[PDB]
Amino acid sequence: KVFERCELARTLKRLGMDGYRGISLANWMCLAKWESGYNTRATNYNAGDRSTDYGIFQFNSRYWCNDGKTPGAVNACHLSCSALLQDNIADAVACAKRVVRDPQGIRAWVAWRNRCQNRDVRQYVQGCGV
């Protein structure tokens, strides 16, 4: 599913993402935007290390989910990577919450640093009623 901006904003708020571990909703929106364009079935194979990024937040198979073909991988979210490709984003949100519970927080995603950090990210939630 490809979410419309405000539809996603409202969904993330209902799932308790606003302010989770000090991260505002606009930051989560900025992250999903640059990671997948709000596309839940987005996948990306990293040929250099044999891992794949899955879903709306592009979780890497080496650390967050199990796909069975990634060498030396762990499954911190205790989910099949298939769960991160559903139209329903409940599992993806639960895993995102797990990721930020680590010390790096939202910085775990390099894309956030390049495109969201220290920027005016208000535009991502503007007019969504959140």
CATH number at residue 12: 1.10.530.10
Which helix (H) or strand (E) segment holds residue 12: the answer is helix 5-14
CA distances (Å), 85 to each of 1, 42, 60, 88, in order?
9, 7, 13, 9
Specify the 3-state DSSP secondary structure of 15: coil
Q: Which of 35, 62, 68 is nearest to 49 (CA)?
A: 62
Q: Which of 19, 2, 121 is nearest to 55 (CA)?
A: 2
DSSP labels, 65-104: -B-S-STT---TT--BGGGGGSSS-HHHHHHHHHHHTSTT
Domain residues for 3?
A: 1-130
Confirm whether 35 is a catalytic residue. yes
Query: Exposure pattern of 53-62 as b/e (b: 16+ CB <10 Å)?
Result: bbbbbbbbbb
The single residue listed with the structure tokens 């073909």 is 69
Confirm whether 7 is a catalytic residue. no
CA distances (Å), 29 to each of 43, 80, 97, 101, in order?
18, 24, 14, 18
- Say which of 4, 7, 53, 67 is annotated catalytic: 53
- Say which of 4, 7, 18, 35 is annotated catalytic: 35
Structural domain total, the chain: 1
List of residues 6+ apart from 80 with CB closer than 8 A? 65, 66, 67
Resolution (A): 1.8
